[PDB]
Design a protein around this motif. Structure first.
Motif, PDB file in Angstrom:
ATOM      1  N   UNK A  15      -4.427 -24.942  32.373  1.00  0.00           N
ATOM      2  CA  UNK A  15      -3.128 -25.138  31.386  1.00  0.00           C
ATOM      3  C   UNK A  15      -3.146 -26.350  30.419  1.00  0.00           C
ATOM      4  N   UNK A  16      -3.571 -27.535  31.023  1.00  0.00           N
ATOM      5  CA  UNK A  16      -3.534 -28.765  30.019  1.00  0.00           C
ATOM      6  C   UNK A  16      -4.538 -28.723  28.846  1.00  0.00           C
ATOM      7  N   UNK A  17      -5.769 -28.060  29.263  1.00  0.00           N
ATOM      8  CA  UNK A  17      -6.555 -28.333  28.208  1.00  0.00           C
ATOM      9  C   UNK A  17      -6.201 -27.136  27.061  1.00  0.00           C
ATOM     10  N   UNK A  18      -5.569 -25.967  27.607  1.00  0.00           N
ATOM     11  CA  UNK A  18      -4.978 -25.190  26.378  1.00  0.00           C
ATOM     12  C   UNK A  18      -3.812 -25.825  25.676  1.00  0.00           C
ATOM     13  N   UNK A  19      -2.909 -26.392  26.503  1.00  0.00           N
ATOM     14  CA  UNK A  19      -1.884 -27.259  26.072  1.00  0.00           C
ATOM     15  C   UNK A  19      -2.322 -28.215  24.762  1.00  0.00           C
ATOM     16  N   UNK A  20      -3.318 -28.969  24.920  1.00  0.00           N
ATOM     17  CA  UNK A  20      -4.019 -29.778  24.208  1.00  0.00           C
ATOM     18  C   UNK A  20      -4.232 -29.117  22.758  1.00  0.00           C
ATOM     19  N   UNK A  59     -11.234 -18.190  28.400  1.00  0.00           N
ATOM     20  CA  UNK A  59     -12.199 -18.684  27.774  1.00  0.00           C
ATOM     21  C   UNK A  59     -11.663 -19.344  26.617  1.00  0.00           C
ATOM     22  N   UNK A  60     -12.426 -19.901  25.888  1.00  0.00           N
ATOM     23  CA  UNK A  60     -11.986 -20.973  24.969  1.00  0.00           C
ATOM     24  C   UNK A  60     -12.540 -20.426  23.666  1.00  0.00           C
ATOM     25  N   UNK A  61     -11.602 -20.323  22.363  1.00  0.00           N
ATOM     26  CA  UNK A  61     -12.121 -20.060  21.199  1.00  0.00           C
ATOM     27  C   UNK A  61     -12.772 -21.004  20.446  1.00  0.00           C
ATOM     28  N   UNK A  62     -12.662 -22.105  20.656  1.00  0.00           N
ATOM     29  CA  UNK A  62     -13.114 -23.455  20.158  1.00  0.00           C
ATOM     30  C   UNK A  62     -14.727 -23.800  20.503  1.00  0.00           C
ATOM     31  N   UNK A  63     -15.177 -24.253  19.436  1.00  0.00           N
ATOM     32  CA  UNK A  63     -16.801 -24.703  19.552  1.00  0.00           C
ATOM     33  C   UNK A  63     -16.997 -26.253  19.550  1.00  0.00           C
ATOM     34  N   UNK A  64     -18.088 -26.736  20.351  1.00  0.00           N
ATOM     35  CA  UNK A  64     -18.370 -27.989  20.317  1.00  0.00           C
ATOM     36  C   UNK A  64     -18.313 -28.713  19.080  1.00  0.00           C
ATOM     37  N   UNK A  65     -18.541 -28.066  18.006  1.00  0.00           N
ATOM     38  CA  UNK A  65     -18.771 -28.745  16.487  1.00  0.00           C
ATOM     39  C   UNK A  65     -17.356 -28.849  15.852  1.00  0.00           C
ATOM     40  N   UNK A  86     -13.156 -30.192  16.405  1.00  0.00           N
ATOM     41  CA  UNK A  86     -12.377 -31.229  16.736  1.00  0.00           C
ATOM     42  C   UNK A  86     -11.691 -30.636  18.200  1.00  0.00           C
ATOM     43  N   UNK A  87     -11.183 -29.485  18.244  1.00  0.00           N
ATOM     44  CA  UNK A  87     -10.612 -29.040  19.465  1.00  0.00           C
ATOM     45  C   UNK A  87     -11.438 -28.774  20.789  1.00  0.00           C
ATOM     46  N   UNK A  88     -12.953 -28.573  20.187  1.00  0.00           N
ATOM     47  CA  UNK A  88     -13.652 -28.303  21.273  1.00  0.00           C
ATOM     48  C   UNK A  88     -14.148 -29.766  21.813  1.00  0.00           C
ATOM     49  N   UNK A  89     -14.362 -30.864  20.986  1.00  0.00           N
ATOM     50  CA  UNK A  89     -14.736 -31.959  21.645  1.00  0.00           C
ATOM     51  C   UNK A  89     -13.702 -32.547  22.352  1.00  0.00           C
ATOM     52  N   UNK A  90     -12.363 -32.557  22.232  1.00  0.00           N
ATOM     53  CA  UNK A  90     -11.166 -33.151  22.841  1.00  0.00           C
ATOM     54  C   UNK A  90     -10.919 -32.312  24.290  1.00  0.00           C
ATOM     55  N   UNK A  91     -11.172 -30.984  24.206  1.00  0.00           N
ATOM     56  CA  UNK A  91     -10.719 -30.254  25.217  1.00  0.00           C
ATOM     57  C   UNK A  91     -11.728 -30.531  26.169  1.00  0.00           C
ATOM     58  N   UNK A  92     -13.185 -30.721  25.933  1.00  0.00           N
ATOM     59  CA  UNK A  92     -14.092 -30.922  26.776  1.00  0.00           C
ATOM     60  C   UNK A  92     -13.790 -32.562  27.460  1.00  0.00           C
ATOM     61  N   UNK A  93     -13.292 -33.371  26.494  1.00  0.00           N
ATOM     62  CA  UNK A  93     -13.246 -34.521  27.329  1.00  0.00           C
ATOM     63  C   UNK A  93     -12.011 -34.537  28.247  1.00  0.00           C
ATOM     64  N   UNK A  94     -11.126 -33.729  27.916  1.00  0.00           N
ATOM     65  CA  UNK A  94      -9.662 -33.646  28.623  1.00  0.00           C
ATOM     66  C   UNK A  94     -10.208 -32.936  30.038  1.00  0.00           C
ATOM     67  N   UNK A  95     -10.955 -31.806  29.891  1.00  0.00           N
ATOM     68  CA  UNK A  95     -11.200 -31.021  31.207  1.00  0.00           C
ATOM     69  C   UNK A  95     -12.174 -32.014  32.296  1.00  0.00           C
TER      70      UNK A  95
END
Ligand SMILES: Cc1ccc2c(C[C@H](N)C(=O)O)c[nH]c2c1
Ligand SMILES: CC(C)=CCSP(=O)(O)OP(=O)(O)O
Length: 344
Positions: A33-38, A1-7, A9-18
């Motif tokens: 792997x790559x979303x967590x790496x970002x 799972x993700x510790x990040x929220x869409x509010x 910065x990391x939530x927005x960019x991981x969503x885009x990357x995925x």
């Protein structure tokens, strides 16, 4: 799972990357792997609320998001996905930004078993005590199938002051054994970046970037070692001279000749809005037999906004020549985490 929220910065960019990983046809395992790496590479920036100002007014992107995406198109193939990140962006000044950037590269070198010796050779040139701008360290990750990325590090020849740009670049090339590479570079208005490939190479591979404030199509073709480069200039510019960037890749220390040449055109500066920029990029891809459909899917992966409601989403289009390979076209796509630049 993700510790990040869409509010955040990391939530927005991981969503885009995925979403972009799906366009690149990466499986679920590599995508994770790559979303967590970002997120890891952003450090504390990942958890930063998008309601706060950008921590650093970085040159990396126009709205100061510390991430930019790019897609490399080869004829008849699915595009390869890359991401550019500023690991030290959530720091208070340029010196600490560089320290955190180097820490991130070292963590990647440990994780994926490559040496930082060639980067270490250059530290006093690119990370002085009181560095000058405009940046300290960026990292480009090529998101390859299998989950082990290609890594490139971008360094600032102006770090010891603008007056020492050429001195710093020439000393760096000499230390890396590329004692004849500087002589191969075209006249230029700036040397904005030096990039070093990190990985399984016993001799350094380096890319030198040159800014041209008033490049003509003819000059672009001249610098390419031709006809495909001049046509690309006109296709992207919509055309006597334009601002552009060249880069010159040196993969051997013997000849002093580059093995690669790229012409980068800042299409965002030439068009009214991103609909026009997408149109030019699509026509170039299609004319070279590349995956123009995937470009439209990538833009939609990054943002749902109408293309004509802003400019700068399509940041650059580049034509990449490399000995032994077919030409490639790269499209650079902005994150727009903080702002959309209005149409002209
Ligand atoms: C081909 C290319 C050139 C420059 C950049 C930058 C730095 C800055 N946004 C700029 O436009 O100079 C980020 N990605 C780039 C990609
Ligand atoms: C200038 C900047 C920040 C990025 C240029 S894109 P790149 O160097 O990753 O392109 P290639 O390595 O040539 O595929």
């Amino acid at each position: 799972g993700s510790h990040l929220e869409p509010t955040q910065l990391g939530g927005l960019v991981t969503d885009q990357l995925a979403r972009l990983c799906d366009v690149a046809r990466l499986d679920r395992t590599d995508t994770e792997t790559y979303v967590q790496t970002l997120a890891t590479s952003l450090g504390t920036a990942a958890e930063r609320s998008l309601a706060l100002p950008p921590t650093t007014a970085t040159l990396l992107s126009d709205d100061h998001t510390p991430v930019e995406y790019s897609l490399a198109f080869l004829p008849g193939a699915t595009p390869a996905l890359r991401v550019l990140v500023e690991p030290g962006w959530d720091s208070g000044d340029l010196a600490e930004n560089g320290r955190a950037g180097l820490r991130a590269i070292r963590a990647m070198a440990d994780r994926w078993n490559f040496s930082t010796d060639q980067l270490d050779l250059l530290e006093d040139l690119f990370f002085p005590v009181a560095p000058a701008g405009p940046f300290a360290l960026w990292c480009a990750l090529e998101l390859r199938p299998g989950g082990v990325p290609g890594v490139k590090v971008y360094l600032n020849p102006a770090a010891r002051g603008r007056d020492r740009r050429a001195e710093t670049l020439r000393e760096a090339l000499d230390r890396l054994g590329h004692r004849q590479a500087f002589a191969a570079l075209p006249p230029a208005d700036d040397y904005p970046f030096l990039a070093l490939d990190l990985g399984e190479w016993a001799a350094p591979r380096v890319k030198v970037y040159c800014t041209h404030e008033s490049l003509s199509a003819q000059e672009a073709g001249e610098y390419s070692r031709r006809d495909q480069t001049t046509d690309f200039f006109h296709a992207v510019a919509g055309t006597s001279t334009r601002r552009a960037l060249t880069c010159h890749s040196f993969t051997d220390t013997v000849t002093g000749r580059p093995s690669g040449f790229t012409l980068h055109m800042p299409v965002r500066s030439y068009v009214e809005h991103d609909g026009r920029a997408r149109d030019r990029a699509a026509d170039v891809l299609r004319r070279y037999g590349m995956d123009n459909d995937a470009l439209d899917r990538a833009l939609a992966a990054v943002t749902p906004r109408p293309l004509d409601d802003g400019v700068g989403l399509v940041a650059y289009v580049a034509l990449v020549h490399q000995l032994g390979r077919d030409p490639r076209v790269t499209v650079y796509v902005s994150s727009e985490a903080y702002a959309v630049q209005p149409p002209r």
